[PDB]
Design a protein around this ligand. Sequence first.
Ligand SMILES: Nc1ncnc2c1ncn2[C@@H]1O[C@H](COP(=O)(O)OP(=O)(O)OP(O)(O)=S)[C@@H](O)[C@H]1O
Ligand SMILES: COc1ccc(C2(NCc3c[nH]nc3-c3cccs3)CC2)cc1
Ligand SMILES: [Mg+2]
Lengths: 814, 128, 131
Amino acid sequence: AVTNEEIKTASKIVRRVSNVEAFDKSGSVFKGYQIWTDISPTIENDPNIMFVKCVVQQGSKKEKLTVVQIDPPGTGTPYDIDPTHAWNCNSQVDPMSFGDIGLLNHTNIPCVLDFLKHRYLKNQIYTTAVPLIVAINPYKDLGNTTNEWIRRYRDTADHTKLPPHVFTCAREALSNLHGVNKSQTIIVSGESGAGKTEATKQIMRYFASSKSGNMDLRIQTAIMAANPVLEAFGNAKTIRNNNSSRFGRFMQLVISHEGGIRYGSVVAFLLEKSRIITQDDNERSYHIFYQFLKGANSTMKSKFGLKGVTEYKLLNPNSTEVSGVDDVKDFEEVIESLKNMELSESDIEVIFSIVAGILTLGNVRLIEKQESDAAAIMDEDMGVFNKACELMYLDPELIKREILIKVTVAGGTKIEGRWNKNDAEVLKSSLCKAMYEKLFLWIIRHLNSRIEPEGGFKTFMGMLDIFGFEVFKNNSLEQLFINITNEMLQKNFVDIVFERESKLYKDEGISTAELKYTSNKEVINVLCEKGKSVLSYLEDQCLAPGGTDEKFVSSCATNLKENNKFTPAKVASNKNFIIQHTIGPIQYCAESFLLKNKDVLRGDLVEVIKDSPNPIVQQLFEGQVIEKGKIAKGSLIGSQFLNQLTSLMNLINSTEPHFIRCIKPNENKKPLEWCEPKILIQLHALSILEALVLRQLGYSYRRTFEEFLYQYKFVDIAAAEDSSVENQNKCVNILKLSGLSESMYKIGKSMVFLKQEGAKILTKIQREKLVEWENCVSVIEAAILKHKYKQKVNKNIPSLLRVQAHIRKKMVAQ
Amino acid sequence: ASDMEEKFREAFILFSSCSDHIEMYKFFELMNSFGIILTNDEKAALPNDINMDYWLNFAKKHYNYEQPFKHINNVNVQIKIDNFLGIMKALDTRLTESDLNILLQITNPENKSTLNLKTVSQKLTESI
Amino acid sequence: ESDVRIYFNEKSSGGKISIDNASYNARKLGLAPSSIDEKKIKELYGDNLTYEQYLEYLSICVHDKDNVEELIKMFAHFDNNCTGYLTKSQMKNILTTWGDALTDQEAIDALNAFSSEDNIDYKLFCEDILQ
Ligand SMILES: Nc1ncnc2c1ncn2[C@@H]1O[C@H](COP(=O)(O)OP(=O)(O)OP(O)(O)=S)[C@@H](O)[C@H]1O
Ligand SMILES: COc1ccc(C2(NCc3c[nH]nc3-c3cccs3)CC2)cc1
Ligand SMILES: [Mg+2]
């Protein structure tokens, strides 16, 4: 599973920042001092492991440490590492005893990986890095998103007693919305298989759980019923996920403050149309095709003339079956769900008629006919063609003509010619893909017509379910659009972190002049700004006749010198180029950019479809512009998508965001399996490690005057218990005599502001003033910990009795 | 004459996760749990790979049979509660807020604003 | 049911059978009693059981809830990196310290009979003894 490319980029993310303090003042190693290191034969031999835990041996010099590995178990062999390969360790801290990574004493990379691992190995998959929520795919049902857990998370007095959970984010989001009349968006992102769609379904069910009833249950039921339906039509089995979402999903919801969905709206973008025609090996097309072909009853097979799943050109004959997936049972769920979105039986019958026609059109074969070199339908497939058009309520002769008869303009004269076999198959394929995509969008249009509020949304809960940054070696158009979307969301992330912090300093009267902001405005521009951007030039090239992938690249390299965000690629500088995204350089290959961007049904085929007698097929392409001459931006994927994205981002930017960052821990779909290089790569692409850094900057440590006094009283117990001093001036006194430099604290209107480093120093200062208690506290704690450990053993003694009981039964066997 | 070997042996495997060797940091917790305390000197003179038999000998030599929690209170004394809880937290105690409340109900039943450290050494001696 | 009545007559005395021998049968019959069961039937009928109580006792010893999932609980508790393995010494210390502790020889023998390897798949060790 772990490739060498994964190891290359994972070692790039590794950095060593803070120094390791393994020696006491006298120069001797602290007895037993533990560190993390990336040098070990364990690491060379097992690519799931990136760091191991060692203890520095007495006698180490300071410029080369001699260590012995202790976790995972080793040889006891001493070896030598450079200090730049030792990282500090959080020894003796319970990873389950708090929810946020930033509360750790050290947050270097091995410490962060290990903190998340030992929570994950105890089935705690949720951890925050404010404002981010990290959620790791357990790849088994942990049993923590049931109705009883929904009720516990919704009805508990103080949600702070409970561990991080997607319900906690749902509950805060809903609580803020009704609390200050502000819309919210929950943004769920991550790579394939990470658990995004499971997360958003769990949040939806939370939102659908009213404390005591929902009069608008009919609307809520339609919204929930949309999950099986959208998955059937838009999800497919890939190598990485048996249930991959091949479209981005946005939802707006109206939710009563005690739970219950009252209104909603659904938006799908960038459906993977190409999957309708062909699929890689061990992959399927959209679930609906297999649900339908396997689940339809004998009468529905008769009407539509259905054959078997292994009998269709558009369906991969060899990946028909997916372990764990009962397509027939899923069909019955889809049929019932369609009715719950208030489609009649007539409507549903039309829907599957169209699907049956799409499948059938794919089985029509074309041949070359030379007198010229025109194309034609194979004679034995003329019924198959006719049935497919009847199945789609299309005019068979008019559809035949648009596929076989080419009109070109030469001079300024229209000339009737013929498409050859290759181009005519491209037209048959376009029709198949167009009809499926528009049928998918029609179903959503219909849904929305039942569940949207008549006036539009006053205040709403948004939900976004999308890929995060995608980085392969070969990146294409599909990844470009994805990575642009995530640049937009990164800017939203950096903005909200800056606004919230700037607001807090202002409110307390702290100078903001030292606040930090890493803008990505320059790379959004290089991708989007009209007239000087990749997307502008992709558009321009597509419009102009004789555009090539290569001429697209070339215009970019000559016009985007102004920012370093565009970088021509070294190898194959035609057709390859690099962009300096926020997460690092990403390389794109412009092969087929123009092919994929212009992949939109346009022209006279659309006009035939619009002329169908059937009222649903009429609405598939309702009001689509007639493209009589040339080709217009209105039918380019990138041009339409960018308007969608802009519209979508204006909406989100008007809301308070919540970021659920999903992580897939291994590539084997297995529980309790931890692959560090792949997890580390995702910690980087999800800006989790940056989130820690971001929050630690400046005066990151705040406590109200009486929290500071409760916390730090013994720094100067005199100053803290002076009955003639207001609580604010007691803090000034304590800090003035602590030893801290002025640069390290500021006194706000109500809080003490501390740089992170000053807080640790203040903590160390208080501990030296308390040296006399060190022995007494060690023994109390240790004695109690022993008892705490014996209780955990007593729980499993009834289990242990059985092991021993059968052991003695087997000794009797002798 | 009072044999502690069984209790020592049980405690070792509790802190070592049932292995016959124990890590140094976990060894410090172990000996601290029987009220044993070392300077940095005797500390740095310990073996580096401490095993069970070593612990049993060390415990025999250092365990205070007459006053196991001498270092909580010596009979050769009362602190406010919030002072005590602060000191615990100041010294980075790994005890959760629950553990501390349970210890406080036990040792200070009447919810007096003072805590007797003699009392704490007593009740802990009882739970050995 | 004949096995039951046969094994009773081997070790019956004055028509009653001792709890120790009654347990020995329960093992011979493929049941696995513990001290808990030995104590439940002590409370009821003393240390010598008539035939009917012996049968009622053998009922107590069936323990159908016994599966691999239930037995491995204590080994799992000490398997911190969740490898599925524990060393022989780890499992020796568990079996000889808590519960109806075995002797060291009994524990060593039971582990060395299951694997010549120092690391033991305790899911498989428990499945082995359960049959
Ligand atoms: N929280 C979870 N608990 C249990 N199983 C989960 C959880 N999240 C995901 N899974 C499993 O992992 C599979 C994939 O998770 P998804 O939510 O479909 O992934 P995804 O993030 O939506 O990826 P894409 O972009 O759709 S390929 C699911 O079908 C479940 O089998
Ligand atoms: C022709 O251009 C494309 C681009 C992408 C797609 C894919 N679907 C989009 C999608 C699925 N999940 N998340 C997303 C998105 C994240 C951010 C924006 S869309 C097929 C993956 C298809 C065609
Ligand atoms: Mg999904």
